[PDB]
Amino acid sequence: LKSFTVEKGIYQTSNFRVQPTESIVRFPNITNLCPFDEVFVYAWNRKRISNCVADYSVLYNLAPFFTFKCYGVSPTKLNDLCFTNVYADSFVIRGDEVRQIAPGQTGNIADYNYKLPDDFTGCVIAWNSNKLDSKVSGNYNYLYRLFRKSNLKPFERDISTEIYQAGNKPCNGVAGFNCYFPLRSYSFRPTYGVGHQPYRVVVLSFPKKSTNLVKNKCVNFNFNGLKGTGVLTESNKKFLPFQQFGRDIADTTDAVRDPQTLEILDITPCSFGGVSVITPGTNTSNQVAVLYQGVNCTEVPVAIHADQLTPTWRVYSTGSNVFQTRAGCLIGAEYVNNSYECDIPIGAGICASYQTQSQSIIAYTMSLGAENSVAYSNNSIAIPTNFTISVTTEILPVSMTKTSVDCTMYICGDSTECS
Amino acid sequence: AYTNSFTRGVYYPDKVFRSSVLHSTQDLFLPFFSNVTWFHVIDNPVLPFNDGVYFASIEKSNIIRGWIFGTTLDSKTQSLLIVNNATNVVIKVCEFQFCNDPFLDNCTFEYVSFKNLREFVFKNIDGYFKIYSKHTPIIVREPEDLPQGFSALEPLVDLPIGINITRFQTLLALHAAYYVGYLQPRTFLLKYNENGTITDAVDCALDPLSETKCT
Amino acid sequence: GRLQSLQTYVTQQLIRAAEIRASANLAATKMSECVLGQSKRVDFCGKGYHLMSFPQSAPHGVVFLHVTYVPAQEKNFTTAPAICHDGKAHFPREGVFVSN
Amino acid sequence: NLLLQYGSFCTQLKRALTGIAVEQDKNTQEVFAQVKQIYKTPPIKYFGGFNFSQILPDPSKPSKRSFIEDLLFNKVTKFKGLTVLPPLLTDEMIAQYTSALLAGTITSGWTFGAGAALQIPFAMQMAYRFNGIGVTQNVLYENQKLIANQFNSAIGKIQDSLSSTASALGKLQDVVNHNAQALNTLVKQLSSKFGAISSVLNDIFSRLDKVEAEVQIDRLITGRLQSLQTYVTQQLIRAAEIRASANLAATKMSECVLGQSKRVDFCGKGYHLMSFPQSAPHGVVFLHVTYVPAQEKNFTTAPAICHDGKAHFPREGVFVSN
Amino acid sequence: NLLLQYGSFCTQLKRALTGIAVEQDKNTQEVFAQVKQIYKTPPIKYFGG
Ligand SMILES: *[C@@H]1O[C@H](CO)[C@@H](O[C@@H]2O[C@H](CO)[C@@H](O[C@@H]3O[C@H](CO)[C@@H](O)[C@H](O)[C@@H]3O)[C@H](O)[C@H]2NC(C)=O)[C@H](O)[C@H]1NC(C)=O
Ligand SMILES: *[C@@H]1O[C@H](CO)[C@@H](O[C@@H]2O[C@H](CO)[C@@H](O)[C@H](O)[C@H]2NC(C)=O)[C@H](O)[C@H]1NC(C)=O
Ligand SMILES: *[C@@H]1O[C@H](CO)[C@@H](O[C@@H]2O[C@H](CO)[C@@H](O)[C@H](O)[C@H]2NC(C)=O)[C@H](O)[C@H]1NC(C)=O
Ligand SMILES: *[C@@H]1O[C@H](CO)[C@@H](O[C@@H]2O[C@H](CO)[C@@H](O)[C@H](O)[C@H]2NC(C)=O)[C@H](O)[C@H]1NC(C)=O
Ligand SMILES: *[C@@H]1O[C@H](CO)[C@@H](O[C@@H]2O[C@H](CO)[C@@H](O)[C@H](O)[C@H]2NC(C)=O)[C@H](O)[C@H]1NC(C)=O
Ligand SMILES: *[C@@H]1O[C@H](CO)[C@@H](O)[C@H](O)[C@H]1NC(C)=O
Ligand SMILES: *[C@@H]1O[C@H](CO)[C@@H](O)[C@H](O)[C@H]1NC(C)=O
Ligand SMILES: *[C@@H]1O[C@H](CO)[C@@H](O)[C@H](O)[C@H]1NC(C)=O
Ligand SMILES: *[C@@H]1O[C@H](CO)[C@@H](O)[C@H](O)[C@H]1NC(C)=O
Ligand SMILES: *[C@@H]1O[C@H](CO)[C@@H](O)[C@H](O)[C@H]1NC(C)=O
Ligand SMILES: *[C@@H]1O[C@H](CO)[C@@H](O)[C@H](O)[C@H]1NC(C)=O
């Protein structure tokens, strides 16, 4: 009311607005675990890992894989990241060339085999694989390049074995000094040090889980991106097998289908209602009753102020005098069987007053009037023998206050630009 | 040749359950009482796709087996191919053609699923390919052409292919009649019963009585 | 925003002016029919049989003092619609045939 | 928080709708609560041969509603932030008011409205109704059975008319239809976009940055506030019209149920005799009992008569010859 | 096409103006059509002088 003194009557203050505290997230369990197990020199083993959600947490958490460098994106966001294609290149790289695998860094493989850009978006996972890629008297299954005519550019498909000519003598298919082959062997052995040990390098060149269900409680829910807040109640609406959501006349979400189990859930968005305040005047007393409109009395202590709620009081909501009217739930007034004239109306023939049964707020059914019966007979009449003169008072409005509005001054204070 | 489509070609526009209501929508629908093109099998000429294609097949021997789609169909770009091989349904996007004359005895996508009347609707919105279907048994003969009645069409296959389609051609089996209609943007007032089935529909641009009904 | 806030006020003043004009027309009808004459309309000007009225001014209004006649002290009597006398049915010209 | 920038638009609509809701109960009180004492009829239902079984309350029903009131209640046939408040006076209380008014009218006539109730036989009361419209009271007592039979037939025709034609209660159907249509349009204005990108706030706040997502939400807020203002203005105009109709209904009740009307065509065509109130869903139904002359006859007339050089004028009536 | 996104405001104003236009004819009918038969005068226009 924006005033310190409240007169006698009923006043509406706020709404009930039962609030949730729990979140349900539900999705189908087809996570589509990408075939990283099938992956983890010149003709690449580039596998277009696509049409699936990649889980790098397996490679991050299991024991053998060690290096987890990532470029373009953070290494911890990978499980949250989606791809059009995951270009995985499982390689066998010597460690001195593993140190050269970086965005913008040169080196032997990074200069002569293939190149990576300075803005490279990808991740590199490596681990020593001596028992799988090291042989006695050298491993010659992998051949590398220590010579090239000119330095490379990223993602340039270059597979060739032609002789590089450095001397004045034309080689033309015959090798020798300054007639160099591109292919030379690092000749991996189990006795090499860590800088010469081969690593199983995979250059990964470049999802929400589902929670358990809570029923018959007003919670926040998410069903396949359909977000809402309500009571997930079991229903029996016959959905069509392609139909997943049900709608009302007003095009609101009335029923849903869980993606895991084919059950039809009706949704009721908590409960709401006006919290009217029934009081006498503050000139008389400060005792207050509270009426919740359209709310059953068995659910207000469930949605008490301890629960998240727009009312946050307990002085006139802690049970005690609780009455259930067709208007709603009245707390703080006692129902009295005696019927009086209507003092403070409520609804559906219920009124409230401040009476000494010392003084307290009482509720009652309104009284229409005094019961009467006319002694009607077919040969009897009743004739007055006296009279009285009554002067009554009738009050009528005629005309209100005349006003006038300066629109220019009201909109613009003293601004010529606003004019 | 041409014949009358009657009130055929009504499909579910969305996966929304509605109970005993009249809902107005504006989508690519086949207009009521439109000239639907008639074809009989003794040919299969290449036909335009436009905004959408309504297909109807009346047969018992299952001669009609599939369709081929594409902008040029010259094995240079992607071209759809849906074939029922009497055990499964195969969908491919391959360049090459199965036979030089199309009959039944690098691909970026592959998917494996007069007593008979099968109704289909193929449409392509933002590259996504939607197929609606309705398979029913009928008793009546090939005169009266399409049966005068009502039947809703339910969705089967959605595709993320993103392939432009302007031409298409049916594929038969060699060792039956069909009807081709075109979808246009129309406003329909669909009637939903208690179980969510589309029981009846009203075309808002046909006659002033249905215009008043939609109003 | 300020133009819409002004328009809402002017619309509500128009509605209130229509209501006030209806009340003023009712007050003018009451004054013309009860101050300038006598009203036979039941409960139009005071409960009971209306005798007269007096007008008084008031801040933004008018106050009518309705003087009316109310019968007070009742008595039972035995009545009859007509009376036989020499084979003739006598009916009262005005009033009620009663008996004590 | 963005709606908090707008001010008192969000509360003055509440104030206007609260005023309308109080005015509805004021209208119902002014129409029906015009009698101070709840009268009731004696158990003997011989009112001079007049049959009142269709409008008097029947104890067989749970509520104290008559047959005609049951027919009127049978002939007459929201969630998103909207509440429908119940009326203060329930239909049982309205039926008790109509029963008290009708019982007082039958047992007394004018006197329960003019003061204390005065019992009088119903034949004498209807004879006084005849004497109020320029017909001498002997015409009733010489035709009482015929008048009672005509009244019983005219009462019995109303049940057939209300059972056959349900379109008589067009205004009481239109009140419910207008309220339902206004509420349906107010709810269905939520799904409109109002020039924004989406009608769902979560899509705007998840797919767009805040510094113009606030502008899109401002567009949606302005559109929904405009829809609410339009609904409140239409409710105000409709409430004014309903208040005018309720004032007219209270005027007809006071001047025809509680008394007898001399105003031409105010209460039924013809010469008015009396009236009956009946409750109805969001309304009142008056049964006007009126006197209509039927069988004309030609006569030769004259203004005055000479007799020994004296002009004689009639005190009451005209001169006829044959 | 931009105006189609706003909603049912046009239908609201059409319904309100249709109600007003019906109410004007109802007012004219209620004021003037209070007689059942069209009475016509006698040809001799003498009514008491
Ligand atoms: C005043 O009118 C009422 C109604 O017309 C008379 O009451 C009796 O009402 C019933 C129906 O409510 C009439 O039908 C009868 O119904 C019973 C039960 O269904 C059935 O067993 C009978 O065969 C008959 O169909 C009944 O005829 C009617 N009684 C009479 C005598 O007409 C009431 O009697 C009337 N009072 C006066 C004083 O006229
Ligand atoms: C997800 O996986 C589970 C496998 O457990 C499936 O859910 C149910 O699991 C219980 C466990 O015994 C089975 O008895 C049920 O038959 C399973 N199905 C249903 C419908 O309850 C479930 O099918 C899988 N898929 C989805 C989309 O949830
Ligand atoms: C408010 O809640 C009470 C809960 O007791 C409802 O009363 C009935 O209570 C019995 C238990 O004694 C239940 O078996 C009934 O199902 C309840 N009735 C109903 C209709 O649910 C009371 O009816 C509720 N009031 C409402 C919903 O207005
Ligand atoms: C009718 O009522 C009047 C009003 O009471 C009686 O007149 C006297 O009125 C004065 C003041 O109004 C009272 O103080 C007296 O007590 C009244 N007299 C008596 C005897 O009570 C009047 O007497 C009544 N009876 C008639 C007129 O027969
Ligand atoms: C006329 O006589 C009747 C006789 O019944 C009176 O009615 C009774 O009045 C007394 C006093 O109030 C009540 O206690 C009785 O209950 C009434 N009888 C019935 C059947 O209700 C009536 O009051 C008398 N009227 C006058 C003016 O004397
Ligand atoms: C009201 O009446 C009921 C029924 O007789 C009774 O149970 C209850 O105690 C009464 N309450 C009061 C306050 O008299
Ligand atoms: C008059 O009333 C009495 C009861 O007071 C009743 O017995 C009698 O039958 C009535 N007269 C007639 C003619 O019905
Ligand atoms: C449909 O075909 C018939 C017969 O060929 C023709 O008369 C009619 O004009 C055609 N209608 C349209 C709309 O093409
Ligand atoms: C066949 O390969 C070429 C070259 O990669 C490609 O452009 C074309 O789209 C491929 N065809 C299909 C049907 O994918
Ligand atoms: C039909 O095609 C599917 C998928 O290619 C295949 O599994 C099936 O064996 C085929 N059936 C016949 C009869 O060829
Ligand atoms: C009627 O009476 C008057 C006065 O008695 C007389 O002069 C006159 O002749 C009479 N006859 C007619 C036809 O007026």
Tab-separated table of N, CA and C in Angstrom, chain A residues 92 129-130 132-144 185-190 192 198:
chain	number	residue	atom	x	y	z
A	92	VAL	N	54.203	-43.579	-35.793
A	92	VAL	CA	55.344	-44.033	-35.006
A	92	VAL	C	56.458	-43.020	-35.226
A	129	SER	N	56.429	-46.985	-27.572
A	129	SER	CA	55.943	-48.261	-28.083
A	129	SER	C	57.112	-49.098	-28.577
A	130	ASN	N	58.120	-49.252	-27.709
A	130	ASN	CA	59.339	-49.977	-28.065
A	130	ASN	C	59.059	-51.445	-28.366
A	132	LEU	N	56.435	-52.757	-29.555
A	132	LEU	CA	55.619	-52.931	-30.747
A	132	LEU	C	56.248	-52.364	-32.012
A	133	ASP	N	57.202	-51.436	-31.892
A	133	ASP	CA	57.794	-50.779	-33.051
A	133	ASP	C	59.319	-50.775	-33.027
A	134	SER	N	59.947	-51.595	-32.188
A	134	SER	CA	61.398	-51.694	-32.126
A	134	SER	C	61.812	-53.117	-32.466
A	135	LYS	N	62.799	-53.250	-33.346
A	135	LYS	CA	63.258	-54.545	-33.817
A	135	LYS	C	64.756	-54.675	-33.590
A	136	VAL	N	65.222	-55.924	-33.584
A	136	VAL	CA	66.647	-56.199	-33.457
A	136	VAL	C	67.359	-55.777	-34.735
A	137	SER	N	68.522	-55.129	-34.568
A	137	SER	CA	69.327	-54.541	-35.651
A	137	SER	C	68.527	-53.524	-36.464
A	138	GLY	N	67.681	-52.758	-35.780
A	138	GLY	CA	66.959	-51.669	-36.407
A	138	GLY	C	65.599	-52.036	-36.963
A	139	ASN	N	64.660	-51.096	-36.893
A	139	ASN	CA	63.339	-51.248	-37.489
A	139	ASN	C	63.302	-50.446	-38.784
A	140	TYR	N	63.106	-51.138	-39.904
A	140	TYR	CA	63.130	-50.514	-41.220
A	140	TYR	C	61.749	-50.422	-41.857
A	141	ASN	N	60.684	-50.670	-41.091
A	141	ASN	CA	59.333	-50.537	-41.621
A	141	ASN	C	58.893	-49.086	-41.746
A	142	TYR	N	59.549	-48.168	-41.041
A	142	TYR	CA	59.235	-46.746	-41.101
A	142	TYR	C	60.426	-46.010	-41.695
A	143	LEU	N	60.180	-45.253	-42.759
A	143	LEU	CA	61.210	-44.488	-43.444
A	143	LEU	C	60.855	-43.010	-43.392
A	144	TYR	N	61.864	-42.175	-43.168
A	144	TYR	CA	61.672	-40.751	-42.950
A	144	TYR	C	62.518	-39.980	-43.953
A	185	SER	N	66.371	-44.445	-42.801
A	185	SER	CA	65.806	-45.191	-41.684
A	185	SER	C	66.420	-44.729	-40.372
A	186	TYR	N	65.568	-44.481	-39.375
A	186	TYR	CA	66.055	-44.246	-38.024
A	186	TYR	C	66.483	-45.533	-37.336
A	187	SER	N	65.968	-46.683	-37.797
A	187	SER	CA	66.378	-48.031	-37.388
A	187	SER	C	66.192	-48.242	-35.881
A	188	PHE	N	64.917	-48.233	-35.478
A	188	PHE	CA	64.543	-48.301	-34.068
A	188	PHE	C	64.984	-49.612	-33.425
A	189	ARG	N	65.575	-49.500	-32.239
A	189	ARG	CA	66.104	-50.606	-31.462
A	189	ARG	C	65.611	-50.496	-30.027
A	190	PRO	N	65.496	-51.623	-29.310
A	190	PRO	CA	65.086	-51.549	-27.896
A	190	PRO	C	66.127	-50.931	-26.973
A	192	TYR	N	67.768	-48.076	-27.434
A	192	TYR	CA	67.903	-46.639	-27.612
A	192	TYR	C	67.438	-45.877	-26.375
A	198	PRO	N	60.983	-44.662	-30.144
A	198	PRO	CA	59.779	-44.321	-30.908
A	198	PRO	C	58.577	-44.118	-29.999
